[PDB]
Amino acid sequence: RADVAQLTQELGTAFFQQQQLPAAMADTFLEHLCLLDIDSEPVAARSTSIIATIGPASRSVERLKEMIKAGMNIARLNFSHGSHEYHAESIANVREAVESFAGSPLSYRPVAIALDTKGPGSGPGLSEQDVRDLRFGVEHGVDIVFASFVRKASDVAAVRAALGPEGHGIKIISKIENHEGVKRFDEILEVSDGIMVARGDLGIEIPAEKVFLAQKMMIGRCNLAGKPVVCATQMLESMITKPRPTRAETSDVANAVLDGADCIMLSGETAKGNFPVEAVKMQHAIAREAEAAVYHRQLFEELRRAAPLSRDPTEVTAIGAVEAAFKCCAAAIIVLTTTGRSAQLLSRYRPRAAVIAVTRSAQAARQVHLCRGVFPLLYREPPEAIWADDVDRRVQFGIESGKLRGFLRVGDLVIVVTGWRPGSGYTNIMRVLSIS
Amino acid sequence: GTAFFQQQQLPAAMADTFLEHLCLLDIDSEPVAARSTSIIATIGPASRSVERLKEMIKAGMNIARLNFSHGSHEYHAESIANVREAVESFAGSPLSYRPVAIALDTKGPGSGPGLSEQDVRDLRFGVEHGVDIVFASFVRKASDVAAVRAALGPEGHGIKIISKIENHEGVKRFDEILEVSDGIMVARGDLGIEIPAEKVFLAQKMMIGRCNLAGKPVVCATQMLESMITKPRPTRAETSDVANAVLDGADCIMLSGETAKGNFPVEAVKMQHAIAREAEAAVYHRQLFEELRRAAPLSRDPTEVTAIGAVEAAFKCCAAAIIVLTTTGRSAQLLSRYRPRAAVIAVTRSAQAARQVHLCRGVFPLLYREPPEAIWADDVDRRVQFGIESGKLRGFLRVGDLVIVVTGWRPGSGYTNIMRVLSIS
Amino acid sequence: QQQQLPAAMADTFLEHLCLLDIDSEPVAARSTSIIATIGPASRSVERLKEMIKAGMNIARLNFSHGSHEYHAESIANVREAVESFAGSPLSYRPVAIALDTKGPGSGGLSEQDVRDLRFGVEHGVDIVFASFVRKASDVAAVRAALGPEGHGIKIISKIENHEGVKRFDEILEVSDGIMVARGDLGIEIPAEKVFLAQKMMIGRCNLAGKPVVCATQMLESMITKPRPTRAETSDVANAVLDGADCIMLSGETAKGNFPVEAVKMQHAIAREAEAAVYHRQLFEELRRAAPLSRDPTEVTAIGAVEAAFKCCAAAIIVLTTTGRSAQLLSRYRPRAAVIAVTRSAQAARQVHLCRGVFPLLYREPPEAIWADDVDRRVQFGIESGKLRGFLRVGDLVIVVTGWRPGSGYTNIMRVLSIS
Amino acid sequence: ELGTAFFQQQQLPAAMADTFLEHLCLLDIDSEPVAARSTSIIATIGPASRSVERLKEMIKAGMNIARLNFSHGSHEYHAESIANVREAVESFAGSPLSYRPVAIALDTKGPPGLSEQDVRDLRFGVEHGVDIVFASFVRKASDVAAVRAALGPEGHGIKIISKIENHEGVKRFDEILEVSDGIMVARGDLGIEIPAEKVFLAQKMMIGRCNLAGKPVVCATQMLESMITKPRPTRAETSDVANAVLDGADCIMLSGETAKGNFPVEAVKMQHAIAREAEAAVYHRQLFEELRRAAPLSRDPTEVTAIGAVEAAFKCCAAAIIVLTTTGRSAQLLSRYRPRAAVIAVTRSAQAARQVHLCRGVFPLLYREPPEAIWADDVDRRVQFGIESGKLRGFLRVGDLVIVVTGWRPGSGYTNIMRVLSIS
């Protein structure tokens, strides 16, 4: 009680009853579980991104606007089905629905476009259809590739080569779907931007009762590496035909978030099912409850103990910023980023504070949805003559957007993360600011 | 041997942090220990036949649930008779015989304020037919438990009352309900309709954590393998749900439609068995034992004191089993609350206690049928030897293993006070 | 590796002790300040220069003995010895002057204490060690006796009896810090209980983030012998391991035959003991127990100490007017030296009360642009650090500054690569 | 119940703290020690402490081990000191409440290897039935093998405590500890052989490694040095004694303080008083957790029974752990886990009763009743003897819980049983 007494008097007892804060202050994981309360309402914005598969049930512009409002952050196009013409029309409809909210940063919501490959099939490596689909992805400006059946590091090098010189910025998320992918996980993660636990094929390739071990191991290793991990397949399966999920399905979504997944996915639930919008809404509601139930006290301690020492100033600033945010219950960490990297390094420490990433790159704003707790703000103003003024203006844009969108309130403390010179790679400053 | 330390997720078990423990989980590290989380199967048309019940007992069913919301007293009396016939068909091999508990799940109060008249009649039927456990529906407060206990009468004092928490009031008054109950059931079906569906996992984790702290059994129930009512294999969310209920700390997991009315009752039991075994090896005992000891209050009860000493000793030598003599099951329950990796082999003469201890994780009941020896010390020894011989036959023990043996200083319940380290010959 | 780094990486406190190595040489600068009592054996300017070189950070004047004229001459000699090194601003070492009161005797605040406290204000003393503090009102009386001109003087309450120990929380609340005055404490309470009072008071001061001094008979045999006993070296090392911000010498420097050697011995033991601190547990416990705060100086301090540990920073350079921003960094016990750049000569002297704070008195011409003036004070911290052996080219440092001039606005932490 | 007063004594509020920092903050000068003093006191016997009357006062003050320093005196002089110690010890055999075994330890003069004088002094020790040898200047494992060989055919049961006194002994510590029964941190010579400011590092390291190995460690030299001429010690001296106990030392020692000083009895009394306060201040919650985590898994039933017994004693705040032992080994394995409960060791071996003073928290009871024909009755008689002596000495009262450690058959090496008994 003495460690939270002054802040309880200042912020109030109602503040410390919400977002599972009594469970968050527990001294053991067992006590943390005992203190979880169904009446402790989540307050923070939902941090785990939702990937929705686009298909016949979720293709129209009107339906896509509803899905964006329900919480869809990434639109997945499964190239195992449909044609290039079909998927190009789906991409155009996603972009039209996204741009319908472009009138202001308060309404605008970047949505990433991910291409999920058909896979190698019976062949030992990159198929000819995958080469054509990957070229289609580059030509249509996709942000992410979910590479099917990645079994070794050379599979991801082949996907990278097939994206060519114009697709260097596309994120490659390797799908682990069989025994070989699980056994060679370390070499695959090393060369990938992230991982997808593709439980559909994994549950057929290895005994079904072992999938949870592979999921927990891969999520843990991605969390340790600071790289995005997606939990996928049959999360809310019964919602393909029913308006409400089973007890096992809500438990599965909550446990994927508690395991440490950066993203959760919907496949048949959004692509063909009768309730695509409701499936997104259900994942949104469960993820916010589960994020508040994360035991940050142990998680942050373990991420520090396991992470090696670093001489990279972005990494050093990120841990100092997350430590400062926890000390004052900061409402947000505002970070300036060109490629999304400074926001990714804050996200790896799993702050409770929202990471508001201010960027001029439309592609980086879409791709940062892969990192838990990163809320992208696309800045469109032309650069100021004095660089320091341009930096200040972007921070103020973050603060004003934050207040207008309810993330920030007068009296809140925010942590601001910036660098000492222009260009990517120079983040080295952390500032504590009081919102007025 | 090196092979010993590669099995049962032992590299993950030796990790210094929970994060590193997760990173070290290996799909090729095979489970070796016997499955410790009990399986409750609901009895219905898909699982009433004596021959089908024998297959369910072989697949791993430990408790048969009778849902009194369906069928007459004559229907439930026939269910009980068929379960007893299937169970007793294996009694000719005493070293391998598996006791099976019979649990009566009540209809509940309905729109009524407390114990309904139909529940009074069903509870009296349960006492007259010798049921072991009552799963009391919609328990909202301590007085609901007292009413169930009063309705069981003087002949039903030994029946365990597991309170089902199915609504907001039951969750809010959980502490007072747990205090007077023998255990709890997280009845997720009604709970997921009474409170927002997205909050059920919080109530499940909280109740399992509190029951683990109290050392009382907790059952996770409803829709765990729902798709197996019609499909031969479960969904990815269903296998995950079963594994996470075990990792959360549930003593028992349950099947409802999957065994009462579905096409795959035996396969549903086999699936829960396979997942539970994998998940039990993935438990991070280093943190769990540390937290259970730290949170458990000091005690002057010799059974409790001997139990923590025995569990600590079992971990020190990687004991294959803790063999305990018990009259009521209490000495085995107090060992189980510390979650040893060693199997707790409970030797008892009480057929009812042998059935009821299935409520406690990691307790393997052995019903001893031999008449007492004239010398009490020789009777205790023969029971310990029966535990060892059953253990060897069932694969729990081998020559060279170390076992912890827990006994008491005089006959009768309540006098457990001795822990002994024994080498299997 | 050096500075007990194998013991520092251990997973348990037991394994940390098992890995302590007599051949692992200390590399960090000595963090625990040394307070030396000035008397007949340590009064001359020449002797005081040798004591400053040996490591004396605070000069204590015991008003239980001598006269106002005697102590004024001691103060003048300390100031002359200190200023003899002012010609090299990158290496100059400030030395605080502390006045230790006679006490209440058989009485609250005595009339002699009122006169001695007035003498302290008139002679610009930095600290008062208030004898026999037994309640919060004793501290208020000392503060009132210092008057309007003595508002900046630090009051370190000396706990010397049972009542002071029992009312410790109320005394610490209103004091700037505490002295565990073991001489009187060991006569007022059973001698075998003094270690419990010492460990409890050091622990509570560490929790409060306030300075604590361990005092009396630490190297007693060195009053007549050139080398201390085995118990004396152990006592000094254990006071540092307990968490003391300062260690003190009384008769050892005031009247003994080896005042310089006594200071050298405390310096050598403290350096060895500081490397043997188990920071892995200490930082985790200090971080867990320090309350949540909305004060930006407090928030920046924990972020800076966390960042320093992440990169093995050689130093945390902090700009401070009153010493407060450096004190808030010191409370988290970083392994990195806290180099405090200040223009206040008094703050530079007083900040010796906080473990791991190395004060640098800035006497360079001002810059017209405030951002440039801040930058030049940071470069001064770096150049003094390189000259003194704290920093080398290639090291990483954490820099702590504020958003506008004046005390109370520290809110920035920056990661900087040296040279 | 135990009462609120019970939980205010023996630093129990500090014992229940969740962190080491909180534990320090909760230490209370008004929380009185209740447990018997567990750290043994070794007193050096010389001119100031040689008479039978003076030795009786030193035994009453708390001396557990009498050290005879063969760097001085002669064989005839030390034989008379041994005879006087034995006469003073046996003067209390008429009262069960005051009879206490006292070990006799021979400290060698020291050395290229084993000196001719050490061979003769070690032979004198065997002939006079000494319990322990403090071997001076042990630098390597072969030095211990030479001492062990010199202990001839009759002295293989004598405990060899290696004195670490120089840089080489510190650097080769692991190999020395492996072959020794225990260690002495001989700070006098160590503080001359290595820089004085590094001695505390060698002391803390050696105490930590001995605690991890489950072997006795003695802290020695200048602990209460000023008491050679003064009636009261300095503040640094009381701190040094308390910190040696908090570091994990099994024994603390007095040299010139008892051998030639003006206040030998007062020096023993001061060590007794400080050790009792310091033992209550030990943070058992972390200590037990770390000893358990660092100790390897074991298939030895004595080791397995010992950890189970210590865990059980902490669970019920047991007043004592009563153990039957012939060699002292079962008591030593309980002692390595540092229980707060007193370890009452009931033995028929007078030698083991004297030697177990090397292990912290072991209170030996020498049992001399003729053996019962039924072995289970002989075990029950010894257990009841431990209980009745415990009630007579103030360790136990009716209603207390005790943990009892025995084996399944007679003979040393078979301890495998832990029982919880309610005192009647």
Ligand SMILES: O=C1c2ccccc2C(=O)c2c1cc(S(=O)(=O)N1CCC[C@@H](C(=O)O)C1)c(O)c2O
């Ligand atoms: O129905 C269409 C469709 C029809 C006509 C043109 C394009 C599509 C289409 O693109 C599509 C569909 C459905 C799904 S699904 O419901 O998720 N699907 C269910 C069975 C096959 C599974 C698999 O990929 O192995 C997943 C998709 O993942 C998907 O991308």
Ligand SMILES: O=C1c2ccccc2C(=O)c2c1cc(S(=O)(=O)N1CCC[C@@H](C(=O)O)C1)c(O)c2O
């Ligand atoms: O001898 C002088 C002296 C002689 C002539 C003029 C000034 C002084 C003097 O200022 C002084 C002395 C000695 C000490 S002491 O050795 O540390 N110590 C000895 C007695 C016990 C302690 C006490 O006050 O309770 C003091 C002092 O602390 C101290 O400041």
Ligand SMILES: O=C1c2ccccc2C(=O)c2c1cc(S(=O)(=O)N1CCC[C@@H](C(=O)O)C1)c(O)c2O
């Ligand atoms: O005075 C006698 C004495 C006189 C006449 C006959 C026997 C003795 C004697 O046996 C003795 C003495 C003194 C000590 S001491 O004061 O502890 N001392 C400290 C200095 C160096 C140490 C050394 O081991 O070399 C010895 C002893 O340790 C010690 O055992």
Ligand SMILES: O=P(O)(O)OC[C@H]1O[C@](O)(COP(=O)(O)O)[C@@H](O)[C@@H]1O
């Ligand atoms: O996260 P990234 O890709 O490293 O971008 C961070 C960069 O953004 C900045 O804050 C602002 O840079 P720009 O003015 O070029 O946008 C830099 O100081 C910093 O290096």
Ligand SMILES: O=P(O)(O)OC[C@H]1O[C@](O)(COP(=O)(O)O)[C@@H](O)[C@@H]1O
């Ligand atoms: O677990 P419970 O019900 O307390 O039973 C433990 C009892 O079992 C025993 O080991 C054997 O008793 P019985 O010979 O009466 O079966 C007793 O010594 C002990 O009190």
Ligand SMILES: O=P(O)(O)OC[C@H]1O[C@](O)(COP(=O)(O)O)[C@@H](O)[C@@H]1O
């Ligand atoms: O530690 P203190 O007393 O609060 O001083 C810190 C202050 O020093 C500064 O860094 C520099 O201030 P000045 O330029 O006035 O010296 C301020 O920005 C900050 O508020």
Ligand SMILES: O=P(O)(O)OC[C@H]1O[C@](O)(COP(=O)(O)O)[C@@H](O)[C@@H]1O
């Ligand atoms: O500690 P030690 O020397 O192994 O002695 C322990 C032995 O003491 C006993 O408890 C009693 O044995 P005895 O009857 O031979 O004395 C044995 O069962 C056990 O093996």
Ligand SMILES: O=C([O-])C(=O)[O-]
């Ligand atoms: O490919 C997938 O997404 C799968 O198999 O789950």
Ligand SMILES: O=C([O-])C(=O)[O-]
């Ligand atoms: O009653 C039940 O089992 C339920 O509602 O889940």
Ligand SMILES: O=C([O-])C(=O)[O-]
């Ligand atoms: O006044 C003091 O310094 C003392 O008594 O220790």
Ligand SMILES: O=C([O-])C(=O)[O-]
């Ligand atoms: O021999 C000893 O005891 C010493 O040197 O400390």
Ligand SMILES: [K+]
């Ligand atoms: K695909």
Ligand SMILES: [K+]
């Ligand atoms: K029912």
Ligand SMILES: [K+]
């Ligand atoms: K004074």
Ligand SMILES: [K+]
């Ligand atoms: K000697």
Ligand SMILES: [Mg+2]
């Ligand atoms: Mg697939």
